[PDB]
Design a protein around this ligand. Structure first.
Ligand SMILES: [Zn+2]
Ligand SMILES: [Zn+2]
Ligand SMILES: [Zn+2]
Ligand SMILES: [Zn+2]
Ligand SMILES: [Zn+2]
Ligand SMILES: [Zn+2]
Lengths: 945, 945
């Protein structure tokens, strides 16, 4: 009908709820973190929507799908085929690019196939293919009474008499030839000098342009072409020469390309893939920078990383031999001393005696190879996934020298459209490419053949621009993207589908998107909506909820406290509902208060100097320590690059001797102001179901100790291994301690189906016979963090760890919920739980990437309480954010790049939120200034009453 | 709505017709051969129906499909997603089986995966997998107060003292063991004899069956299992021993199978495929029968086929050496004389001098290898697709000795269900398998797990039975089937789909189906129809049209004469319509008259003796010559086997020295009564668009001679090669003379899209400038056979060839219609055109396989006129038919096998149609007798008036 109705859903924490959702309108689900938004939107509606359709694709599909586990719902009528847009269904697997995922690159292949003009690499001439028809036509183009001279280029500048020739075009009975530019009569006693080059062009027929001259031209052309192996010269009189050859081949060198097909431009096909790399575009060779961490480390104390505890004594051998000193800061070493040890003696024998691990001496007489060819050789020769991975650590990816990293054949790159070939177009940014196709100038036929293709390309690029991804390149690897970037890329791709009658389910599409470009997102969503489709968007953003048609608020609280439907109607009706916790924030009843004062920076500053990694413009910044710092700026400004790729990696290689190669920068000062830098990543916790909050926090380690110490375990001799999750002693031998069997879904994403032997309890029958206060290990692993700390108020050591998970924002999630099923924000927060409670010496720096992701404003409050508590104890908290409710709370903000892409990568404004708010050139402050003034008045309104 | 309407279709010969078709009812299209039945049903309705759906599967699909060539129709509303059932979409590609195509085999894999009991090959015991839970349970099954003796089988009959052992289970501190059946106390000074076997079973714990005995049992089991590497003996007191091991492994030999998955039983996966053949089930080695055509040919005149004009002189060398005589009928040769030459000297040096092709002599001293290892070696070593194919001619397929031809692993065959494994079940016939699953006896759990699978298997088998294919095996190769068998297999498979709202388009499903089983076909069609689907069936059969709801008769005549809708309504309304040519036959106004007398056989008989090839039962038959012979019988009776596999191949190897190995038979007499045997196959004419009626008949050869002799060609020097279809001289260089470019459809069947350079004219511009009576070669190649002979009444040699195509039944089809687009019957008929006009010496035998296929009864008349004209001139016409209108016309009929499968392959009745009609045991005569009496009265009714 005109609305989708769902009856009695109980996905996870849902309380047998009924809910109506308006068809074909922008519906927005909201609530606190873990109130059950995903349980309804994704685990219920989208699950049924996908299943019901895919289950009807065939019979085997219905047999395979109908036997598994269907969502926990009574009935849900008014459904439509469902398509989810989240981070869960975006490709992070190599060989894939932005061009491939957005489907744009395929359209590019099609374009190059249709109208692409293939050229000879050597000669740079558009190699053409004809039948005789198209040959005659062009010759007919010239006006009435036009003359020419058909020449069959029999010989083209070849040294040699050609006496074997001149007899035979004379044997046949020709008369008119052209030798070394001068034309001559046959039987004219012609002789050519042996060691001299000669250009012979036989003069077949010579015509006047008149009526019906076709058949004669024709015939003469066939003659001439049969003479010089399908090669003919059409020397015009008055103008210049014209040449034919037929088939995709060059008239001057043989080089051929046959036919223009799409797969000729694909790097997932041998029809297009480069030979010297097999369409990878990336080699894998030793980086000089990885071999030596710092350019100034004592060679006596293992300056070279790979050769580190035979080799240390080889070092001694070559050093002795060449006179290379041991006690050395590599930086001051002469270049040859380093060239010998790094690249080899080049055949010269080096004496080398060494004591084995046993103790016996064995002298040799080797021709030393070097440190780099050592790594390459040992990595290349071994067929072990262990040794390889041990040597790959000192290697990096370097663009294929043959294909220039374009992954395609040299003849595939020979085809160009607008003077640019496929790879060059791929290497542009979305802006650059959009501009390219705007300014691209074609012919009548070309544009008429490729109208439908060009419109699609332009539209897709424009979509990527709308979603705000107009900075990244089409050649950008898929795996190198962020979560938001990937989700939004899938969003644009999906916009390109133009589907109708589809129930889209988006999860927080404003993730990693500056507030400025919010309206655009909203604008495109509705467009999708206005294409006869229905959107169910799970958000927390204000404007996304204000521009919404309908608006459902889910569950007062999280976990067992939520799972209900608080308020539901227009964003004006939910706004005017006291029960809705969310409405209290939109109306302004409850809000996040601006600090009375901001922590003025002391004398401690980090100084990043000369940062020029990606789109950074020789940038130099000063980060204040002991304060809440927010690095803001539009997406594409390179916040990730500065904060993570440059700062964190340098600080890590310095403070913890990390091996990650830091981004291009001059130097970083104030390094003495702190001891440890913790980057609380947003990457998942574990990659197997073996990992969970309890495991990652270390709680599960202690939790086995209490079971091992209980009465029954003592008399059963179970220890802290029988209750161990990954230990054969007591775990379910069927699932091998996984608890959940992973089924193989071919085109659909893989599904976790509970182990039918342990029923998901993850342990065997006898292991769970051992009880602790009326509950076994499977039962306690199933407990909620809140219920857990309420259960373990007993042991202080368990308690102080669970308390971290509680303060963090969670406490609605279970101890044994597998890490593969955790939201990115949830994972980041479980890590925040690990770093939360530590004895702070006031000299450590935390780095959080968008810790807002997946949180309600009300949750942002508590989280900010936690972080500001970390700042209070002397530590420094750095945060990459777009969420204004956090930016305003910060004591110091560093705004990056005006606009994104190459238009940016430079500091727009630094200082306090107010100091940046009064910067007109900053979009951040342009959107922050009215929020500062809004909530500032809200407080004075409250304070006056 | 409730009916599908098509407006203004002009597919091929359609005359801009409008037609309404009733939804969800058995609609039947009929008419004369080439009236435009396929043009409407398949080239119009099904084309649009498939396209409209597949075009909506994605965006790239719509882009790829919408740019091609859509059917020539105005509009066609009320469409449904379309699925065609014909011979065009059945798999003839190797590795595929009946089980795979009907999807049944996959269900078999599923069944064997779910409930299959894997057994050890060596020991024949069901290898089991457990956790400790399932171990304890079975031990708990036995009543209260039951006793046992837990034994950890540490050593199992190993020769050796085990002094290293007995100290260590004593070092730990055990006491109770069991050695060589006798139990003993540790520290009892135990010594075992070195060269004697010893059986040591340590006696862990000994219990009474009581309450909560779990944990103790449990613990002791873990102890014992950890003792003997997860192996334990549970020796019961009163009964016998019970053994556990956990995981799919055998307690006595190690052998393992891990887990039961479907892909473990697939031969299209390395998880199931045999090692020594890679899941092919077929080797490929030299057949002794192919090396020597007859067992009695002069060795002087190349008795061995492969060694036939070096080798002839090698023959002389080995013959000299061993004393093997040259002038020899191989049959009388001693076995060793033949064993030496065939299998080799076995190392013994043979002198061998030979004269090169040059003339010089070169003596050698080789160790002769033989004639067979010669072939195997030369075939194996060469990597050329030419040499290989030259040696494969003397080779045959022989079942893989390792896997018994079951293509699966030895451990895959270890799994059995009803005492039979997967391959044995696959090797049964549909009847045998159906009976097997009827009589299969299972447990509660097994039957409960596999109910849905078993029902599907049973249903599919039953469907195959309904369509009449209950004789062939599930293991039968897909490529070895006939056209009707494959079409009908696809029909059954499609019945199994249970789809709804689908527009099925069948093409003559009664092909290769005896009249008896017609009602069944009709019965299932309706079932499909009664599943909310609409069937459009193109037929010619009476009963199929009588049982029809609606019934459309297309086009009065074929070609340009048809393409319209004559009559349309119920089969009672079309029956009572004078305009309908078909109705005149159903009503009985016009019919095929029974001969006044039948050609009594003279003294010439072919005598097939002792035929036992497939399901033939030592059969011996006498075929009368100089008469119209019809070999009839139910499908599965082995008509193909007798007529083609036995008779034709023997007659061919004798009369034309054909190399095809004839079926198993004793002898064939009367071979002196004829000179040539022509089998007019129903296989296609050509496999490329290069072949067509004009080419196959040889008309196109002469047709180039007239163009080569015309005025313009003389002055242009074009000859019988410039106008040649496959010659660069004048053909379209773009399509390379194909005229139609073949596009690549991945999951859909491949489509032919016209060459955009020659517009399908197949020649370049200048070649078609040469004219003959106002028409060029492209134009004349486009002409209809009728219009052609009307155009070439001129040249008698062209005329007498086109006339054959006319008399045949065609003459509505064009000269240049590519052979890949010809119906099987059409092809067979174009061959009938080739053999039609020849100077008959009265001593040749024709063999036609179901020449009725794709013909109206009215066409059957003319065709029978032709064939009986062939019989009139002295020749003999043999025909394999189910069509009663032909069988009744025959002068002599030979009915095969009562029922099909192994229930058959024996003569039911021979003689005149009336003599077989009075045979009660013949289904043929049981259905022929009332037709004989029907039309006999129709004639007397006409004769009396
Ligand atoms: Zn060139
Ligand atoms: Zn490359
Ligand atoms: Zn398990
Ligand atoms: Zn065994
Ligand atoms: Zn095999
Ligand atoms: Zn062509």
């Amino acid at each position: 009908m005109d609305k989708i109705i769902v009856k009695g859903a109980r996905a996870h924490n849902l309380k047998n709820i009924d809910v109506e959702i308006p068809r074909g309108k922008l519906v927005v689900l909201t609530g606190l973190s873990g109130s059950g938004k995903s349980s309804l939107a994704f685990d219920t509606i989208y699950a049924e929507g996908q299943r019901r359709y895919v289950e009807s694709l065939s019979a085997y599909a219905r047999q395979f799908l109908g036997q598994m586990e269907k969502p926990d719902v009574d009935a849900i009528e008014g459904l439509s085929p469902a398509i989810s847009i989240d981070q869960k269904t975006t490709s992070r697997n190599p060989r894939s690019t932005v061009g491939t995922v957005t489907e744009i690159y395929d359209y590019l292949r099609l374009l190059f196939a249709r109208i692409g003009r293939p050229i000879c690499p050597t000669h740079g001439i558009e190699i053409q293919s004809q039948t005789i028809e198209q040959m005659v036509d062009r010759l007919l183009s010239y006006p009435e009474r036009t003359k020419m001279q058909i020449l069959a280029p029999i010989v083209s500048g070849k040294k040699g008499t050609h006496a074997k020739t001149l007899e035979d075009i004379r044997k046949q009975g020709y008369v008119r030839v052209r030798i070394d530019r001068e034309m001559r009569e046959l039987t004219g006693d012609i002789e050519l000098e042996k060691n001299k080059k000669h250009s012979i062009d036989v003069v077949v027929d010579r015509i006047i342009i008149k009526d019906g001259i076709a058949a004669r031209l024709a015939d003469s052309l066939e003659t001439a072409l049969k003479l010089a192996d399908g090669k003919v010269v059409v020397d015009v009189i008055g103008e210049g020469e014209l040449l034919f050859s037929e088939k995709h081949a060059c008239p001057y060198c043989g080089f051929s390309i046959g036919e223009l097909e799409p797969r000729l431009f694909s790097f997932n096909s041998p029809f297009g893939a480069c030979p010297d790399c097999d369409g990878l575009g990336a080699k894998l060779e030793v980086d000089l920078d990885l071999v030596i961490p710092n350019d100034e480390l004592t060679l006596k104390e293992h300056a070279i990383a790979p050769w580190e505890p035979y080799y240390p004594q080889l070092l001694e051998a070559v050093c002795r031999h060449y006179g290379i000193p041991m006690d050395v800061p590599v930086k001051d070493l002469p270049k040859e001393q380093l060239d010998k040890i790094l690249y080899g003696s080049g055949g010269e024998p080096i004496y080398f005696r060494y004591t084995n691990d046993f103790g016996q001496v064995r002298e040799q007489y080797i021709a030393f190879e070097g440190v780099i060819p050592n790594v390459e050789r040992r990595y290349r020769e071994t067929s072990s996934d262990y040794i390889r991975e041990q040597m790959e650590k000192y290697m990096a990816e370097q663009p294929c020298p043959t294909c220039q990293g374009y992954r395609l054949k040299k003849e595939s790159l020979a085809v160009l459209v607008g003077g640019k070939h496929i790879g060059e177009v791929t290497a542009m940014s979305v802006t650059e490419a959009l501009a390219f196709f705007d300014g691209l100038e074609l012919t009548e036929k070309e544009a008429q053949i490729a109208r439908l293709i060009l419109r699609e390309i332009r539209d897709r690029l424009g979509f990527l621009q709308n979603v705000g991804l107009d900075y990244l390149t089409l050649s950008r690897s898929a795996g190198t993207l962020s979560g938001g970037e990937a989700q939004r890329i899938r969003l644009a791709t999906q916009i390109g589908s133009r589907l109708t009658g589809v129930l889209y389910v988006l999860d927080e599409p404003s993730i990693g998107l500056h507030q400025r470009d919010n309206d655009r997102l909203i604008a495109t969503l509705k467009s999708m909506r206005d294409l006869g489709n229905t959107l169910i968007v799970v958000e927390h953003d204000e404007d996304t909820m204000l521009a919404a048609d309908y608006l459902i608020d889910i569950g007062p609280g999280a976990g067992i406290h939520g799972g209900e439907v608080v308020a539901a109607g227009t964003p004006e009706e939910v706004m005017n509902d006291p029960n809705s916790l969310t409405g209290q924030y939109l109306s302004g009843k409850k809000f996040i208060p601006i600090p009375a004062e901001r922590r003025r920076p002391d004398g401690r500053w980090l100084e990043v100097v000369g940062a020029r990694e990606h789109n950074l413009k020789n940038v130099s910044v000063k980060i204040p320590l002991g304060t809440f710092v927010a690095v803001t700026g539009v997406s594409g400004s390179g916040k990730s690059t500065l904060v993570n790729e440059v700062l964190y990696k340098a600080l890590a290689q310095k403070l913890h001797r990390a091996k990650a190669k830091p981004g291009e920068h001059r130097d970083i000062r104030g390094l003495e102001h702190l001891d440890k830098v913790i980057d609380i990543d947003q990457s998942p916790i574990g990659r197997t179901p073996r990992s969970n909050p309890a495991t990652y926090t270390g709680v599960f380690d202690d939790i086995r100790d209490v079971f091992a110490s209980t009465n029954e375990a003592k008399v059963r001799g179970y220890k802290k291994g029988r209750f161990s999750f990954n230990v054969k002693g007591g775990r379910c031998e069927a699932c091998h301690g996984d608890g959940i069997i992973k089924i193989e879904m071919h085109f659909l994403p893989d599904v976790y189906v509970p182990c039918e032997v342990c029923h998901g309890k993850r342990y065997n029958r006898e292991t769970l016979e051992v009880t602790y206060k009326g509950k076994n290990i499977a039962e306690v692993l199933d407990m909620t963090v809140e219920d857990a700390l309420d259960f373990f108020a007993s042991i202080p050591k368990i308690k102080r760890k669970l308390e971290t998970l509680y303060d963090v924002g969670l406490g609605y999630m279970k101890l044994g919920q597998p890490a593969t099923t955790l939201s990115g924000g949830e994972a980041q927060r479980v890590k925040l739980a690990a770093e939360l409670h530590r004895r702070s010496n006031g000299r450590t720096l935390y780095i959080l990437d968008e810790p807002t992701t997946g949180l309600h404003v009300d949750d942002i409050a508590r989280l900010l309480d936690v972080l500001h508590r970390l700042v209070d104890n002397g530590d420094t908290v750095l945060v990459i954010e777009h969420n204004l409710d956090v930016i305003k709370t910060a004591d110091y903000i560093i705004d990056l790049g005006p606009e994104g892409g190459d238009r940016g990568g430079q500091i727009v404004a630094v200082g306090t939120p107010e100091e940046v708010a009064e910067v007109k050139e900053s979009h951040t402050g342009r959107y922050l200034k009215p929020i500062l003034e809004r909530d500032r008045a809200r407080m004075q309104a409250r304070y006056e009453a």
